[PDB]
Amino acid sequence: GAPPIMGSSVYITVELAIAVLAILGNVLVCWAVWLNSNLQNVTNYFVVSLAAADILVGVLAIPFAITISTGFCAACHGCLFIACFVLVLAQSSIFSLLAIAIDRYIAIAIPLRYNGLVTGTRAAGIIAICWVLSFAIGLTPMLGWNNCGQPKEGKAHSQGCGEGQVACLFEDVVPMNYMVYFNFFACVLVPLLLMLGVYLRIFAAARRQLADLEDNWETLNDNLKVIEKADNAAQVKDALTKMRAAALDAQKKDFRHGFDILVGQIDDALKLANEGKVKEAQAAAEQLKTTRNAYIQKYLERARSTLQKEVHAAKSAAIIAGLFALCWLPLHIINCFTFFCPDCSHAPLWLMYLAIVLAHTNSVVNPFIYAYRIREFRQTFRKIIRS
Ligand SMILES: CC(C)CCC[C@@H](C)[C@H]1CC[C@H]2[C@@H]3CC=C4C[C@@H](O)CC[C@]4(C)[C@H]3CC[C@]12C
Ligand SMILES: CC(C)CCC[C@@H](C)[C@H]1CC[C@H]2[C@@H]3CC=C4C[C@@H](O)CC[C@]4(C)[C@H]3CC[C@]12C
Ligand SMILES: CC(C)CCC[C@@H](C)[C@H]1CC[C@H]2[C@@H]3CC=C4C[C@@H](O)CC[C@]4(C)[C@H]3CC[C@]12C
Ligand SMILES: CC(C)CCC[C@@H](C)[C@H]1CC[C@H]2[C@@H]3CC=C4C[C@@H](O)CC[C@]4(C)[C@H]3CC[C@]12C
Ligand SMILES: CCCCCCCC/C=C\CCCCCCCC(=O)OC[C@H](O)CO
Ligand SMILES: CCCCCCCC/C=C\CCCCCCCC(=O)OC[C@H](O)CO
Ligand SMILES: CCCCCCCC/C=C\CCCCCCCC(=O)OC[C@H](O)CO
Ligand SMILES: Nc1nnc(-c2ccc(O)c(Cl)c2)c(-c2ccccc2)n1
Ligand SMILES: CCCCCCCC/C=C\CCCCCCCC(=O)O
Ligand SMILES: CCCCCCCC/C=C\CCCCCCCC(=O)O
Ligand SMILES: CCCCCCCC/C=C\CCCCCCCC(=O)O
Ligand code: NA
Numbered sequence: 573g574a575p576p577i578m579g580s581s582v583y584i585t586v587e588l589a590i591a592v593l594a595i596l597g598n599v600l601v602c603w604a605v606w607l608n609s610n611l612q613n614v615t616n617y618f619v620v621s622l623a624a625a626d627i628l629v630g631v632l633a634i635p636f637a638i639t640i641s642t643g644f645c646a647a648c649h650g651c652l653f654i655a656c657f658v659l660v661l662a663q664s665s666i667f668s669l670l671a672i673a674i675d676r677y678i679a680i681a682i683p684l685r686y687n688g689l690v691t692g693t694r695a696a697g698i699i700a701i702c703w704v705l706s707f708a709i710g711l712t713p714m715l716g717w718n719n720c721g722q723p724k725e726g727k728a729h730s731q732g733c734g735e736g737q738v739a740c741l742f743e744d745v746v747p748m749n750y751m752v753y754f755n756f757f758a759c760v761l762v763p764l765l766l767m768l769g770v771y772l773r774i775f776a777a778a779r780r781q782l783a784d785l786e787d788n789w790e791t792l793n794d795n796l797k798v799i800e801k802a803d804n805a806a807q808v809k810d811a812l813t814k815m816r817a818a819a820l821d822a823q824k825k826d827f828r829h830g831f832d833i834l835v836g837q838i839d840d841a842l843k844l845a846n847e848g849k850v851k852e853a854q855a856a857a858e859q860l861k862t863t864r865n866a867y868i869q870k871y872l873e874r875a876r877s878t879l880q881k882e883v884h885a886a887k888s889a890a891i892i893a894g895l896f897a898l899c900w901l902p903l904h905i906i907n908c909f910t911f912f913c914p915d916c917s918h919a920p921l922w923l924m925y926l927a928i929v930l931a932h933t934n935s936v937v938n939p940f941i942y943a944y945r946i947r948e949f950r951q952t953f954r955k956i957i958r959s
Pocket of ligand 10: 630631634635636638639642644
């Protein structure tokens with residue numbers, strides 16, 4: 573049995589290094605949003621809320637984790653607070669991640685009403701509510717769902733603790749049925765699964781809109797060919813009405829002028845078609861190609877480019893949510909083994925330390941994801957560091 577202070581020294585040193593990086597990187601995120609108006613939007617207010625949770629992991633949760641690794645003597649409910657505080661920060665992160673996903677879904681699904689529905693003032697209120705709920709959920713053991721009524725008195729005596737004190741260790745004070753059923757299943761797993769459902773809807777909505785744009789583009793070009801090889805006015809009329817509906821569906825200044833020219837030219841040709849003048853209708857329909865080459869294809873390309881950027885932004889957000897799940901799931905899975913398999917030897921202490929370090933590393937990774945995936949953050953980071 574090697575001296576406990578040695579393996580402790582490795583765990584503590586790694587924890588302190590992570591805390592430094594979590595503070596530095598996420599302070600940079602907050603400084604960037606504060607300074608760049610192009611970064612000031614509802615999505616990034618939740619990003620800042622998430623960065624604040626990660627700053628508090630470095631300032632508070634990691635010092636608390638180091639403290640409760642020692643098993644020092646503490647009043648049981650004081651031990652409970654420093655043990656449970658990381659649950660507040662993890663819960664706040666989950667709420668911010670879910671809010672970000674929902675924000676991106678509103679933007680892709682109803683962009684015309686996004687600016688009227690999703691405002692900064694409503695966002696600040698949601699953030700406040702989510703922090704209150706995070707304290708309520710994370711500190712629920714302090715309301716009585718704890719093991720302080722049944723302390724490990726033999727462990728307390730062997731450490732010289734006073735009366736009312738326990739050896740302060742996470743699993744000795746926080747009940748495992750709370751950790752598995754309430755914290756993991758209900759408060760972590762269910763919101764992560766909801767997030768997965770939201771992102772599936774976001775990418776399904778984007779794929780559908782990028783299909784719908786190509787279908788309307790195909791309908792405009794296909795029916796142009798139908799008119800050229802038509803032989804009577806009724807075939808021209810049929811293909812023109814289909815073009816007119818495709819044009820109005822695709823419509824939903826230089827943008828409006830291009831579609832006004834298009835529908836007007838379709839109407840010009842339809843009037844000729846209704847009068848039985850096929851050759852004049854076809855010549856009129858040929859004028860549409862000039863409008864298509866100078867306006868309509870430009871709208872189709874820019875609409876595609878806007879959709880691709882929304883997909884890119886949703887993928888960046890989903891990566892962040894997925895990395896949260898990756899870094900936190902090992903701890904929750906270990907707790908499931910401890911709880912559901914009392915015939916299994918407890919996960920060894922080195923593995924507990926590794927799982928805790930991994931969870932804490934998640935508070936380091938988001939600034940790197942923003943830097944590598946969002947140009948506006950990356951360029952703002954560069955200016956902050958240079959200047
Ligand atoms: C403004 C912010 C930074 C203040 C942070 C205050 C923190 C560090 C304080 C608030 C409550 C405090 C705890 C309250 C009660 C106990 C029980 C005692 O037997 C050992 C210390 C312990 C566990 C305290 C440790 C420090 C503590 C967690
Ligand atoms: C920013 C300010 C307002 C934060 C206020 C938080 C204060 C009120 C809370 C935080 C944690 C709390 C402590 C947590 C646990 C214990 C140990 C218990 O045996 C006696 C009370 C005591 C010591 C609590 C007193 C109140 C306390 C210090
Ligand atoms: C993709 C990621 C999230 C999956 C992580 C899986 C990890 C957490 C799993 C895979 C194998 C698992 C271990 C398999 C067997 C045992 C022995 C048992 O006596 C205690 C738990 C313990 C030690 C498990 C702990 C959790 C464990 C390490
Ligand atoms: C990751 C997402 C998709 C779902 C989370 C799956 C979790 C809840 C699953 C993955 C592996 C599972 C464990 C696999 C094996 C055992 C050993 C058995 O003696 C008791 C249940 C227990 C401990 C399972 C509990 C539930 C478990 C931890
Ligand atoms: C620079 C940062 C300073 C940080 C200061 C670090 C604190 C060091 C004090 C005690 C650690 C002793 C080693 C902890 C060993 C674990 C004890 C434990 O697991 O519980 C008790 C149990 O009885 C055992 O079997
Ligand atoms: C920017 C500033 C923001 C706020 C910064 C706050 C930093 C908190 C640091 C450490 C918490 C460690 C607290 C635990 C120390 C417990 C040691 C102790 O209390 O030992 C005596 C006890 O009776 C055992 O026998
Ligand atoms: C485990 C503990 C769980 C505790 C469970 C109970 C908590 C209450 C729940 C939600 C409060 C929602 C607050 C709503 C605040 C008022 C909002 C408002 O007035 O604004 C309307 C706005 O115009 C629309 O856009
Ligand atoms: N058995 C057990 N032991 N320790 C922790 C623990 C304590 C302090 C921390 O800072 C961290 Cl990250 C983890 C958790 C645990 C598991 C999932 C979610 C929250 C806590 N579970
Ligand atoms: C780009 C520069 C980065 C800033 C430097 C950050 C320095 C932090 C690195 C390691 C933390 C070391 C913790 C010291 C251990 C104390 C002794 C002990 O383990 O008990
Ligand atoms: C920017 C402010 C950050 C706050 C600084 C906190 C850094 C202190 C590091 C670790 C916490 C020390 C925990 C002490 C354990 C007590 C050991 C014992 O009593 O047996
Ligand atoms: C212990 C608390 C458990 C119940 C939580 C109650 C819900 C949160 C309570 C108060 C938050 C107050 C902030 C409300 C501002 C709303 C702004 C808005 O949404 O537009
Ligand atoms: Na986090």
